């Protein structure tokens, strides 16, 4: 069912229920639970991590993943192995770092070519995309998170694919990655439980933006002062979000696009419905992330079309699906909170200045040092202007 | 059963089920739940916090702890008192601070003697240990967290003991604190549920390190550029962790030890098994943290020996044990996450610059001020080189 091989050489299949999860740009991940048996013994007693799993979904979808977590429990006179795994087109990026500090202006192809140095994978952009400047390179950082920053600046979304060729993974970078899908949904036919959530606690009608003042000014608001607003503003009225304070961008064409993007990203709609697969009927609905879909729930006020952003498959044996879960538009309110928490908890404990007993000594020492050197610089300025 | 006394004078016993927890270096803690009775009335209605608890484990283990939390619930025509407590060889450290900012080079005995000033407790190192330099003292900080930093630099582990003498607590500082233990374990005899967890999401085969460049350079990689790797690398291959960027260490002998320590700390194995005490048989297995133990689970592929890192006792009455829980090697995956979260949540809210509505004003103001003073300094440099 599931062909797993060491990092050197031959394969071996095992039957086990799988739980895969795929997002548009975020890392995909799977999980499963092997158990000891008369079969599987030679494997289960001999798996070391970074075992290479593949041939999920049968004799197709040869998307090769790698295990990183390994649990081993004892049940009766046998033993379980829960385990986790991640993509090679993502892990292979988490392999390598870059030490040369990228800095300055950077066109997109140059940037996403220097980071694909030695990995072997390939990138390509579809539409014309502008260029910007990256302040400090991640000398002690992965290729992955610099890929994150690059997507945040230039290519707002992406999609990988195992091309026909061996050891190749084309990264189609694109804003708002999508493909049409023939299938569809409705409350009656494929949508058991439709949770429509409309979160708006950080939302906006008009908004201000400042983005060409030099690095040393910070508020003497030169640099394309403007405020924009969306169409819905006129009935809701005067509100506004955190203005686009940070910016070294010259033109005004940018200052409206980024600004309206700051607006329309905030009136959030997460549809964490549930999907239930029909095999004997409607088989042509294998959900895949980053596709278009036309949902329609009667008695809800809903017929529009949306895009998948999260999908969650399970597959017991023979790669037959049991159920699906999906989320549309924004991935969740939930997962946004959880990522916020985990980012806080990992950014912290990666630092070293933290001292829980009276913190801010490390920050206040720094800030007072800064103001003191500024005072000394003032003295130097006066003393030099004297001469 | 449990002799508790005010901070001034006489004792009073109470019977109550206790839940103790002991780690190697981390603070131990206990918890228990007294209830109103015809007995215990004079006490329970008259406990104030920092009541001094002792004589746990009977007429032995006179490890005197102190209460800091006090809950009081109403059950029927009676009342409960849940409560928590902590060690005096740790709380007595959380008592006192140091205001003189320790700074500069520091030999270990000097450092761990200036911090034991007025506490009365005693420290000693067993093996020869090098010395380093501490950048800023914790003028507004506990003796405890400076003890933490000191252990992080020089003495990578420790172990306290109530010596025979009164009001004395010897801190045997040591790397990898351990003592042999005659007892042992196996799946059949003492290990009900063996959860072996092998976490590797931040792991390494080779690794780079930079540690003698001066404070003002930050990447012009002078200072013992090197990359090392472990023995298992050759089959897993090219990966690497966050390089040892931060460092003011001259020699190369250090740069391999610390580096391989960064490696081998990361392929993590947490064995959060469960222990069940046999009283009529096998009584000589009172588990204590920071000891060696030889586990062996058949049908698992396991006969090696490990060390305890966490233990969790309970004792109903007459100081008879009911069950034990323990964790081996690294204390958990779980508790690492939870400590990460709580460190984030307490480091935050100890600060004052935080403003949830558009943060980064406090950081960007600072950074732009820094670049502006650097620009002014450039002007001064040019204007002085003129003269």
């Amino acid at each position: 069912t599931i062909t797993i091989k060491p990092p050197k050489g031959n394969g071996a299949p095992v039957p086990v229920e799988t739980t895969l999860v795929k997002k548009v740009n975020a890392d995909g991940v799977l999980t499963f639970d092997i158990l000891e048996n008369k079969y599987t013994y030679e494997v289960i007693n001999a798996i070391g991590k970074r075992w290479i799993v593949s041939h999920v979904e049968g004799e197709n979808d040869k998307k090769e993943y790698v295990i990183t977590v390994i649990d081993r429990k004892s049940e009766g006179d046998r033993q379980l192995v829960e385990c986790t795994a991640r993509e090679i087109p993502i892990d292979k990026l988490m392999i390598d770092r870059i030490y040369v500090n990228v800095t300055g202006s950077f066109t997109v192809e140059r940037y996403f070519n220097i980071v694909f140095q030695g990995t072997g994978m390939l990138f390509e952009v579809e539409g014309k995309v502008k260029s910007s400047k990256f302040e400090n390179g991640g000398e002690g950082d992965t290729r992955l998170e610099m890929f994150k920053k690059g997507l945040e600046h230039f290519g707002l979304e992406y999609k990988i694919t195992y091309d026909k060729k061996k050891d190749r993974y084309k990264f189609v970078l694109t804003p708002f990655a999508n493909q049409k899908a023939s299938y569809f949904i409705s409350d009656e036919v494929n949508a058991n439980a439709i949770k429509l959530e409309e979160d708006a606690s950080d939302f906006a009608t008009f908004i201000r933006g400042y983005g060409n003042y030099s690095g040393e000014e910070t508020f003497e608001h030169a640099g394309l002062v403007m405020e924009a607003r969306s169409a819905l503003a006129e009935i809701y009225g005067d509100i506004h979000a955190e203005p686009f304070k940070d910016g070294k961008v010259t033109d005004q064409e940018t200052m409206d696009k980024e600004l309206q993007s700051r607006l329309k990203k905030s009136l959030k709609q997460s549809l964490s419905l549930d999907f239930l697969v029909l095999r004997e009927s409607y088989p042509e609905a294998d959900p895949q992330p980053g596709d278009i879909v036309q949902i329609k729930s009667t008695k809800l006020g809903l017929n529009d079309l949306v895009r998948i952003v999260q999908v969650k498959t399970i597959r017991g044996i023979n790669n037959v699906i049991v159920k699906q879960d999906v989320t549309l538009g924004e991935f969740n309110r939930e997962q946004r909170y959880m990522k916020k928490v985990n980012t806080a908890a990992n950014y912290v404990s990666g630092l070293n200045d933290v001292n829980l007993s009276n913190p801010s000594k490390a920050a206040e020492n720094l800030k007072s040092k800064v103001a003191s050197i500024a005072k000394s610089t003032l003295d130097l300025m006066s003393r030099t202007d004297l001469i | 059963t449990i002799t508790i006394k005010p901070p001034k004078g006489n004792g009073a016993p109470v019977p109550v089920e206790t839940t103790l927890v002991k780690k190697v270096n981390a603070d131990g803690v206990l918890t228990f739940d007294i209830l109103e009775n015809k007995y215990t009335y004079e006490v329970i209605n008259a406990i104030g916090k920092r009541w001094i608890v002792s004589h746990v484990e009977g007429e032995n283990d006179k490890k005197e702890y102190v209460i800091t939390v006090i809950d009081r619930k109403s059950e029927g025509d009676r009342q409960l008192v849940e409560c928590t407590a902590r060690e005096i060889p740790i709380d007595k450290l959380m008592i006192d601070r140091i205001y003189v900012n320790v700074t500069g080079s520091f030999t270990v005995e000097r450092y761990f003697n200036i911090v034991f000033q007025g506490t009365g407790m005693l420290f000693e190192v067993e093996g020869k240990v090098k010395s380093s330099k501490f950048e800023n003292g914790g003028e507004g900080d506990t003796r405890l967290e400076m003890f933490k930093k000191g252990l992080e630099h020089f003495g990578l582990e420790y172990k306290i003991t109530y010596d025979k003498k009164k009001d004395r607590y010897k801190f045997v500082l040591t790397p990898f604190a351990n003592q042999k233990a005659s007892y042992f374990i196996s799946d059949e005899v003492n290990a009900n549920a063996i959860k072996l967890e092998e976490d590797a999401s931040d792991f390494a085969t080779f690794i780079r390190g930079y540690g003698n460049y001066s404070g003002e350079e930050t990447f012009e990689h002078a200072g013992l550029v090197m990359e090392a790797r472990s023995a298992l690398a050759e089959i897993y291959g090219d990966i690497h962790a966050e390089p040892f960027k931060d460092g003011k260490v001259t020699d190369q002998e250090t740069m391999d030890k610390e580096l391989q320590s960064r490696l081998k700390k990361s392929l993590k194995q947490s064995l959060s098994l469960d222990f069940l005490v046999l009283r009529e048989s096998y009584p000589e297995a009172d588990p204590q943290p920071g000891d060696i133990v030889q586990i062996k689970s058949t049908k698992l592929g396991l006969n090696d020996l490990v060390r305890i890192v966490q233990v969790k006792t309970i004792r109903g009455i007459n100081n008879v044990i009911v069950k034990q829980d323990v964790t081996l090697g690294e204390f958990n995956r779980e508790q690492r996450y939870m400590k990460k979260v709580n460190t984030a949540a307490n480091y935050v809210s100890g600060l004052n610059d935080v403003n949830l509505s558009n943060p980064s004003k406090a950081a960007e103001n600072l950074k732009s001020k820094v670049a502006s003073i650097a620009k002014s300094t450039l002007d001064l440099m040019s204007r002085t080189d003129l003269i």
Partner: peptide
């Protein structure tokens, strides 16, 4: 009392592969 551990354990599981 028994319950906090299961949720926190699944949370730490989720901390694996949550980030690009």
């Amino acid at each position: 009392d028994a319950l906090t551990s299961i949720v926190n354990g699944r949370n730490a599981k989720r901390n694996s592969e949550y980030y690009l």
